[PDB]
Design a protein around this ligand. Structure first.
Ligand SMILES: CC(C)CCC[C@@H](C)[C@H]1CC[C@H]2[C@@H]3CC=C4C[C@@H](O)CC[C@]4(C)[C@H]3CC[C@]12C
Ligand SMILES: COc1ccc(C[C@@H]2NCCc3c2[nH]c2ccc(C)cc32)c(Cl)c1OC
Ligand SMILES: CCCCCCCC/C=C\CCCCCCCC(=O)OC[C@H](O)CO
Length: 368
């Protein structure tokens, strides 16, 4: 028998995988490096991730073509094989863990909206941890090495040698950040409901004690119903402070005994709650719109790596499956995840108007 020639596949991948991977990540790095409106702390995640996926298209992907164009005889120097295999597992694991770090980070931005500055250092710490985790996962490859009389080596991980690494490594590289991003998913669904619920609670506590005052025919109705709003009240240090002093300024009229004067102070306070509720109504509308975008984009990413890591584990556990027909799948399924990681940064940043504006400027060679 005979297999034939598979050059048209390598041409197809360059046009639709390697070129989009190299081009998309380079656009993302330029947007953070050039445009200063994007030089925030959370975008250093996007830059760190864009550099990892860029290194895939430059070093990992071109060598991976040689398995498709050429034969099963490693055509490059020997040490290059475990180095390429090390870089392959390293950068492919970094991309999945960056998204887990982003999923966790963005959940913290919702649940604990307060922390800010300190944020520049916290990212570099989280970036480092993500890269160190990817090193410890990819380090078994250059340590064990590829087995050899014939100096010709076959550069691929085998089931006999890396059977435990193909399994436990898959557990730590994909299914562990998968399980985390699933947990942070429901944490974010719950965090946004309570954030919107707490709002409905305060909105009525104000609007109920307000109608009490406009219908008040005495001062005691104003005294007690205003204290209910006193304990129920950077920019946040001043947000409540505006109305905490107004309730005090209005109770000052209530301690005087002025009924019509105090009621007029409350009816003119309603133009102050609509200034803070409308602002925080949006903060929660936008906090919910960005979560649904990150949810779908991160899901399609993780979904396009499911074929490889399920087959990568099945090739270890299933003793009755056809090894020839299963490694033929890994040869293909890897390129699906290569696409997933290659364009994941670009897709996620296409939903940012500032990023999308920067891209449209750079594709026509502007650079401001
Ligand atoms: C045949 C293979 C190996 C080579 C593929 C060519 C690649 C490297 C070329 C083809 C198109 C190129 C991109 C075309 C557009 C831009 C916009 C520019 O503002 C930044 C560089 C960037 C993003 C280029 C980066 C390099 C690029 C992706
Ligand atoms: C030529 O095409 C191919 C190119 C590269 C590879 C290796 C693969 N690269 C994606 C990441 C990853 C791989 N292996 C792991 C084993 C364990 C862990 C944790 C991760 C990984 C294969 Cl398997 C190819 O198919 C034959
Ligand atoms: C496997 C499918 C089973 C359950 C998936 C449930 C949804 C899992 C999708 C999670 C996507 C994600 O990463 O969410 C992070 C969150 O948005 C940060 O704010």
């Amino acid at each position: 028998e005979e297999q034939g020639n598979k050059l048209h596949w390598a041409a197809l991948l360059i046009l639709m995988v390697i070129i989009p991977t190299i081009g998309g990540n380079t656009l993302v790095i330029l947007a953070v490096s050039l445009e200063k409106k994007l030089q925030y702390a959370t975008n250093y995640f996007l830059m760190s991730l864009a550099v990892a996926d860029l290194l895939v298209g430059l070093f990992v992907m071109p060598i991976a073509l040689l398995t498709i164009m050429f034969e099963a005889m490693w055509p490059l120097p020997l040490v290059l094989c475990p180095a390429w295999l090390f870089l392959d597992v390293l950068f492919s694991t970094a991309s999945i863990w960056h998204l887990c770090a982003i999923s966790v980070d963005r959940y913290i931005a919702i649940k604990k909206p307060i922390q800010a500055n300190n944020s520049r250092a916290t990212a570099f710490i989280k970036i480092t941890v993500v890269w160190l985790i990817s090193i410890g996962i990819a380090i078994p490859v250059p340590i064990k090495g590829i087995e050899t009389n014939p100096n010709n080596i076959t550069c691929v991980l085998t089931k006999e040698r890396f059977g435990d690494f193909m399994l436990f490594g898959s557990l730590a590289a994909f299914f562990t950040p998968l399980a985390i991003m699933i947990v942070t998913y429901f944490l974010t669904i719950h965090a946004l409901q309570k954030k919107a619920a707490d709002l409905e609670d305060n909105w009525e506590t104000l609007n109920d004690n307000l109608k009490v005052i406009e219908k008040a025919d005495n001062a005691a109705q104003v005294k007690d119903a205003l204290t209910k709003m006193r304990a129920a009240a950077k920019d946040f240090r001043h947000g409540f402070d505006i109305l905490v002093g107004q309730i005090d300024d209005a109770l000052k009229l209530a301690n005087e005994g002025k009924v019509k004067e105090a009621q007029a102070a409350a009816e003119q306070l309603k133009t102050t709650r609509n200034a803070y509720i409308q602002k925080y109504l949006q903060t929660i509308s936008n906090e919910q719109r960005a979560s649904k975008v990150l949810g779908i984009v991160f899901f399609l990413f993780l979904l396009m790596w499911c074929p490889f890591f399920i087959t990568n584990i099945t090739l270890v556990l299933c003793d009755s499956c056809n090894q020839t027909t299963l490694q033929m799948l890994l040869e293909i399924f890897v390129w699906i995840g290569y696409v997933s990681s290659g364009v994941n940064p670009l897709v996620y940043t296409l939903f940012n108007k500032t990023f999308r504006d920067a891209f449209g400027r750079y594709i026509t060679c502007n650079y401001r």
